[PDB]
Design a protein around this ligand. Structure first.
Ligand SMILES: [Zn+2]
Ligand SMILES: [Zn+2]
Length: 470
């Protein structure tokens, strides 16, 4: 009895955001500022090659910490051609308005990975199969939206190709708005106390019963992190690191691997200083490495041999992955609101325009004689739109805490049949990243959709929603 579909889709796999920062006083580094006495940003690929050349000059004639110029230079050579890669030069002025030192900040990442096109194409083909079995006329009524971010449009483009300018960027609905950033900071400060001292798993807050107090979990993660840093150092100092993995996608090499983890090891070596914003960073890198650098991850963290044969050795690492998922399940989802009122206000400030559009599109599909509208959005809108759904009081089949992580290519579906059925998918998500069978593509298949509600009267679902718009 199908009549239409309004599907919200998250962007596909992306690389972790990474940056190197160092300050230099040598003249060759100061000359990169080209006389300017304020922050200088470099994003022209040709300008990056010139800066790259400056690092090679510094190398031949010692100008700065040689070890640190190599890591910046090596990272830049591999990353100079990636959109979003930039250099920031922050000059430091002394009492006489003279630049005495310049901070060199190299930032890169946040681009869709080589795996994203595969994930998006499978979904577009799957949806073509699904549609050509429900009603072939639906393909003639496809409308596609995308945020302005490159990673989001990238996902939208390959899904559209797989499904069949038609993609209509809509900044007001699907791009980020500073309306909720004022309120998410009020919330962010509220999460720090939840993790420290001895808060007894405050209220429900998405936390397992068998787990000890949040502060104990953090302290154990620090122990596992301090443990693996020493393994990594021991492996770099003794073994050949360049032979620990035969495939390096995205132009990465063992040096960039060490940098991502060296930073995290620095940020997770004192439990009384762990920042809750950095839990998501730790967990984002663990998925990335488990997806794209498993072999090197195995070997560079391989302890060796402890007497007995085949004695399991990746015990401390599996524990670390498990504990990071707990922290990611009870901090990051609560950046969009802790209390129901916070989840509500942040949810409206972020996704109210999109929510009004969806109900109207469902209303049009009822009056037309089926169609589909796909909105490709950043990760933030999926949580917030979901929060609006729950706080509306509409009868659910599953509680919020029970939903799986809203991973890459997570979807929210509004199926119109008169009756509305809500379904969701966690996207390309796995419960055992260290055991999943991977291809050379470093690509995980997508999880089928699950029903959030049953068939609910259309006229009913509009009152509960329009009552929350006050
Ligand atoms: Zn200037
Ligand atoms: Zn890869």
């Amino acid at each position: 009895v199908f009549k239409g579909l309004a599907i919200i889709i998250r962007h596909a796999d992306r690389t972790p955001k990474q940056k190197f920062k160092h300050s230099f006083t040598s003249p060759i580094f100061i000359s990169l500022l080209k006389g300017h006495k304020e922050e200088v940003v470099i994003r022209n690929v040709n300008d990056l090659k010139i800066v790259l050349q400056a690092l090679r000059i510094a190398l031949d004639e010692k100008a700065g910490n040689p070890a640190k110029i190599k890591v910046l230079a090596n990272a830049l050579e591999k990353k100079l051609n990636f959109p979003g890669t930039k250099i920031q030069l922050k000059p430091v002025l002394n009492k006489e308005n003279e630049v005495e030192k310049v901070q060199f900040i190299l930032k890169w990442g946040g681009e869709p990975t080589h795996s994203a096109k595969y994930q998006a194409t499978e979904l577009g083909e799957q949806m073509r199969q699904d549609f050509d079995l429900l009603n072939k006329s639906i393909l003639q009524n496809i409308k596609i939206f995308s945020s302005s971010e490159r990673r989001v449009l990238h996902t939208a483009q390959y899904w559209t190709r797989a499904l069949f300018d038609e993609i209509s960027i809509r900044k007001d609905l699907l791009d980020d708005s500073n309306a909720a950033k004022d309120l998410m900071d009020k919330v962010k400060k509220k999460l720090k106390p939840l993790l420290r001292e001895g808060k007894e798993a405050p209220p429900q807050f998405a936390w397992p019963s068998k787990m000890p107090e949040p502060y104990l979990v953090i302290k154990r993660v620090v122990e596992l992190m301090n443990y693996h840093k020493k393994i990594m150092d021991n492996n770099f100092a003794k073994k050949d690191v360049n032979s620990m993995q035969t495939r390096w996608c995205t132009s990465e090499d063992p040096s960039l691997f060490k940098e991502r983890w060296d930073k995290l090891f620095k940020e997770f070596n004192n439990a009384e200083k762990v920042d809750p914003s950095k839990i998501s960073e730790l967990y984002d890198t663990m998925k990335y490495d488990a997806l794209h650098n498993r072999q090197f991850l195995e070997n560079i963290f391989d302890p060796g041999s402890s007497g007995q044969f085949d004695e399991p050795r990746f015990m401390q690492l599996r524990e670390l992955y498990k504990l990071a998922k707990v922290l990611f399940d009870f901090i990051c989802p609560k950046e969009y609101g802790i209390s129901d009122a916070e989840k509500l206000d942040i949810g409206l400030l972020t996704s109210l325009p999109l929510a009004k559009q969806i109900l109207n599109d469902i209303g049009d599909m009822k009056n037309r004689e089926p169609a589909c509208v796909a909105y490709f959005t950043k990760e933030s809108h999926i949580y917030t739109l979901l929060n609006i759904i729950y706080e509306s009081g509409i009868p659910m089949r599953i509680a919020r805490n029970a939903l799986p992580e809203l991973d890459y290519l997570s979807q929210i579906t509004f199926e119109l049949y008169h009756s509305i059925r809500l379904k969701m998918s966690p996207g390309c998500h796995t419960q055992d990243p260290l055991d999943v069978q991977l291809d050379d593509r470093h690509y995980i298949s997508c999880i089928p959709k699950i029903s959030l509600t049953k068939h609910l009267d259309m006229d009913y679902v509009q009152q509960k929603l329009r009552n929350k718009f006050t």
